[PDB]
Design a protein around this ligand. Sequence first.
Ligand SMILES: Nc1ncnc2c1ncn2[C@@H]1O[C@H](COP(=O)(O)OP(=O)(O)O)[C@@H](O)[C@H]1O
Lengths: 107, 107, 87, 86, 98, 95, 496, 93, 93
Amino acid sequence: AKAKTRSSRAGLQFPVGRVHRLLRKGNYAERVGAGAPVYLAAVLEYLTAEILELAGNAARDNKKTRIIPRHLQLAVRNDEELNKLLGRVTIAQGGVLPNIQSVLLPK
Amino acid sequence: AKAKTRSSRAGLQFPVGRVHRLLRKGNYAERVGAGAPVYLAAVLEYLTAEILELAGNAARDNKKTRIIPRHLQLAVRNDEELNKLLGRVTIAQGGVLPNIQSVLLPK
Amino acid sequence: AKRHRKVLRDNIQGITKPAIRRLARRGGVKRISGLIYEETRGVLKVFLENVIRDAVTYTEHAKRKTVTAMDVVYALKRQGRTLYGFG
Amino acid sequence: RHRKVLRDNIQGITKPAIRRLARRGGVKRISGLIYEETRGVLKVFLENVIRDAVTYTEHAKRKTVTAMDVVYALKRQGRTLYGFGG
Amino acid sequence: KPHRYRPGTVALREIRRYQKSTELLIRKLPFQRLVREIAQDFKTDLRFQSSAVMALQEASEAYLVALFEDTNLCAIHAKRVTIMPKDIQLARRIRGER
Amino acid sequence: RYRPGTVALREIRRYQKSTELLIRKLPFQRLVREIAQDFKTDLRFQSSAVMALQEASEAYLVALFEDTNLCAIHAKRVTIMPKDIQLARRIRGER
Amino acid sequence: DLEGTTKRFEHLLSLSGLFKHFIESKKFRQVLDVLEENQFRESPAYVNGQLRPYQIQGVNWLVSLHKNKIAGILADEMGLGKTLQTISFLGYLRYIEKIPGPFLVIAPKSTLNNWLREINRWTPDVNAFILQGDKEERAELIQKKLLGCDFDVVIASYEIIIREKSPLKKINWEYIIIDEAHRIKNEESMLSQVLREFTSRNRLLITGTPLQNNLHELWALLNFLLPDIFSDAQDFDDWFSSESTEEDQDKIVKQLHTVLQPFLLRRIKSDVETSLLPKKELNLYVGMSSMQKKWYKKILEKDESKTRLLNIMMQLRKCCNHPYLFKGAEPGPPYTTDEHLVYNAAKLQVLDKLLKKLKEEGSRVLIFSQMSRLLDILEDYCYFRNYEYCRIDGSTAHEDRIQAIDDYNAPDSKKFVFLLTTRAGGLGINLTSADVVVLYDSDWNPQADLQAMDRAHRIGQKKQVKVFRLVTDNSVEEKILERATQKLRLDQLVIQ
Amino acid sequence: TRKESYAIYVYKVLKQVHPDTGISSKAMSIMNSFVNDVFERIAGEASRLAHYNKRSTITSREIQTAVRLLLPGELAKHAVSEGTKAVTKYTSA
Amino acid sequence: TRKESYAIYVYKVLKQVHPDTGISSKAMSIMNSFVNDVFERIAGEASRLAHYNKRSTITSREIQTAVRLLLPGELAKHAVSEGTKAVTKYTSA
DNA sequence: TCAGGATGTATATATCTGACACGTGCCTGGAGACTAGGGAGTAATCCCCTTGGCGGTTAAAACGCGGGGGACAGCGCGTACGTGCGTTTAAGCGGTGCTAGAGCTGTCTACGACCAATTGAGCGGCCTCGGCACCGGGATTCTCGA
DNA sequence: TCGAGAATCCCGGTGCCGAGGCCGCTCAATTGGTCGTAGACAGCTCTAGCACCGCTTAAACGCACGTACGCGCTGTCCCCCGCGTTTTAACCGCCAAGGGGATTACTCCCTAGTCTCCAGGCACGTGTCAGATATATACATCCGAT
Ligand SMILES: Nc1ncnc2c1ncn2[C@@H]1O[C@H](COP(=O)(O)OP(=O)(O)O)[C@@H](O)[C@H]1O
């Protein structure tokens, strides 16, 4: 019997034993299933990969390799659905994306 | 060896045994105290008596003996701190308390 | 011929012009323009669409086929519009 | 553990600071009565979130308002802040 | 000449009559058909308890009343008395909805 | 000299592009300690508590001014006033 | 109050002693042991005219029930004069017994004008209203005139009596005469609940036919005749075991030849006769076209279809009737008036054949259906064959219902067919000028078909009447037809 | 068929505040839903407040802090007074 | 002293999305706080979704309905797809 | 319409610094093996929702019209923020103690969990009688004119 | 500048149906008694917060212009209000079926515990290159006129 982790059985990068322990000891329900920590691991994979992919594009746009919280700010509030999810949270050291009202600037 | 309800040891009306069972089975924490259901029963006593006393005065205003959802609406939102508690909740069959903007009525 | 159901005034138009008129009188407004009505039908359709999507999600989870009142209460509470009276 | 009781307390939030803070918002032509009003509404906000943060501090029987207490005050206040643990 | 009122007297009298009242205000059977039409799209052939339709109607009524009250504040800010589409969309652009 | 209205748009383009923390740290320190003296006496603070509190209040007030700018341009002007900065936090759900 | 209760119980036991089966085995056993130890065949000319000898036969049955102080049911056939027998019984309490009131009759709204014509045509000395009008005008018809007590007979509707239950509790009634009484076939109807709240001396009842579906209908008609006798729901169904549906030994129905006869008087067509001609009836078992054979599988076996399956017996009823009611079986826009329409309904294929055989004979037909949407298909098909017609239906009008009948009963009317629905137009209309009458489908009420069959088969019919029922082979309708066939021998073999 | 509710207790509190005023049925349902709401807010907040200190049980100090934290201003003072009064009278017996 | 921080998993996902892009520690802290926020939302909603049905265990269908109910619109469909793909690969092997 | 400064953008040498990797200890994830409960899944009972039609009643809705008060461009004018420039001044960085208290371990009990008898409060079912809704009618009163 | 006239509130009367009482039962509270084990308190350590002080220089402030935007005022249409008259759709009743959602109730399999080894990842030291200042090259854009 050689121990094989079940982050590898489902083929994920996020841990499944950690999210299972944390979901148990955070007294959500009285019993947990077997498929629930695998399912949560998968959706956290998808969300992290999606927001980080948009931040990577926005970092490469300003000719920078290493990413900044400003780039996370632009990738969050420059999309639409991911803006709708995180619409109420602020972000540290993020700033505001540029817009000026239309009838304010001269013509 | 004869029973005494611990709703009566505190001198309350709300049931301490029921709120203890409900706070246990509603999986809020892994262990529950002894003074915690007593404290909750007391604050529910006070809040219910307060909203219902203002409701009784507002029902006595309109020459009524039985109270109505209209009277609970006028009891809540004509108050200040109780309006601050219940600001985000609508009430069925309530209606709006009367106001007309001041620069809208003729003169 | 006229043998078809295509000739009918559609269903959002049941919210009549005097109904929104009364509904704004309760809000306390004196004089109403003529372009409130179509935009208000748009606003109501948006609001109901979100609430009824959440309600049908709560029903379809529990393997029923009929929407209860507690269902609508849970949807409106989750969205942040908690409704007393039916719980 | 000393006290250098220095006056002129709240309006150390100066008007060039508040004007920069409005230029980030996208405004163009600021009146002269914005200033005392904005100091008032900032004080209201800061009152509420510090009241809750010091309640969370006092509950765990400590003397230092940590960062996590302020994150929790903002969390239940309505507006979450990422970046500072938790 | 017959007896007419000035334009605006009937409006204030209506405002008093509906703010004093507590009835349910947009009608029942057209709202029934609207809910069935709006939820045919999400899944076919559901059924509705009638108390669920009453709950949904009371919630939309309360929401739409509060929206018109906010629109009236914004219109009276613009130094008018008529409400328009401009402020009925400002009053929920400023809310967090658009 | 410049026309009145050019330097303002240059400052808009500057302060919306940067991300630095914008009001000065030591008067904000004294404001927080002055306003928290009232609830409990003689507390401590971490540095990151004051930084978190400053960053939150700054973002709050920036979003408030953006909404006030919309509410000012609604009345067909370009100048914000007390009237619309209290209309905005009336209509938000705060007043 | 027990003065007539003695006269009622003793007159129950004045006949064959099957009445003792439940009265002994029932407060209503108290007065039993107190008592257990114990004409006019001249056509009387107080009416303005004559009385037929069979009409005299019915009127004498009424004063039989009157003197013995019990109620009844007058369930004869229309055209025989149920009204004239009723009016002459009222003049018996004006020219013989001379009891000047009060009187209350209730009828459907379509017949109310025909009553007050018929009152003064035979007893002109009667003071009687027709209580019409709105909430304004009914107040003068109550306060100024009904409260003035200057009346004899009040003629109300089924639905004004619901709005006006409060000003009619003030008057204690000598008679309540309910006409066309299929409304009280339910015991839990809103109208029957109002009726028991009144006060009466006598309670008459005139309907066309008794029960259509269950035995449970008929006793509720008799419960609101004389509630002192039954007042019981368990004790009538279980004593009879619901129409002898288990053995058909037909010895429990001997008891119906003992119970119903002190309260019922139903007479056959063979009296005069009415149409002076017997009629026939055929069943035309037709198949299914290949398109609607798919749609029968598109619903059950869940196969283009995209159908909602809410009411099974109603969705499949459209498939058995005509495929193009499902609005997706139609070919797409632009819509063509074409012969492939009739190709996918096997009934229309026969109907195309059937109208050609009768165009030569000139036999003008009346067509019935349970759905107005399927008349809309025949609305276009008669144009596509260039056939003149008219369409009386629900939601047309009331004034339109006068004219198009007078078109079709006009001499030398060039209208080939004439369209109607079943439960709509049974309002005493005359369509005897047509000779044949066909149907389209079955019905859960066999008497609703059977009352509709006498649209042309009444007084004034001179040609032979044929009925053709389009029945779909091995489908939903052959279940419904046999269930309708089952209920027809039921009230036939009870009465006849 | 068995359903539990805070009905009779609200009626008792009504009759020891107003000796003659009655309550309707709709208002009884609306106040039953109210006390369910306030109970769920306070207990759910004390849950995460006890979680923030790595402390397993929930005790009277947690309800103390949560009612101080959840309901505003001058109302918290009287609620704290009522709760501590009930707890002292409970532990005295 | 032991502190669990989600950092290395975020770095692995970064190294298989953009194989050459790095991340600063402030951004790593901010995304740590992001996954804790989203995790607590989904788990806390699935808990009360299981409480409404009088069911004791929390299961895959609860997380299914919670992640459908919670994160908006078009973003829910791909998340459901990733979740079902992972669960079927887990039970099959 | 074209020259004139003060702005924003490649542009290349040139430091600090903090992210990325490498190498070590130890904490929990897991394999597994037995048990017990929870929830699935058939299987009766009954009662509120659904379709496609009839009938009647009756307030709402739809439409139309005259007209009048509001929205809305122009227009003048008068303070009042914007811009810039000297002149203070206090924030910011950079050391340097100094100690309050955050945090961690060690015992060791008070106190919730858990269990089985036991038995009184609360929940469905019944009746029943005034509180409220409604209807003329009458007095008052608010809005429209001289 | 006070009369006409319609709207609203305040008087009686009926009547009806839901809110308050009582009755029976039954099943969650309540008592009494073990029993493990969170948290309470005491004690030690070391770390991050607090108070200084000095030096430099961005930054605030107070002054002067000066033009441009806010605001009152003026006609001028013109769109929404108020009332009168058709007209139609809600709103009840009714038909005639049937069907999905709640209660026992019973028997598998899923998950939680429990002991046991090993490896994952977290902290802690080294030891390098992407970002930033800086800083002098050339670079694109509003501003009196014409
Ligand atoms: N002896 C008679 N002579 C002439 N007409 C008669 C006679 N008896 C009955 N009628 C006719 O019969 C009609 C009564 O119709 P009736 O069958 O009572 O209708 P329903 O069945 O709808 O009550 C009257 O209009 C009357 O003219």
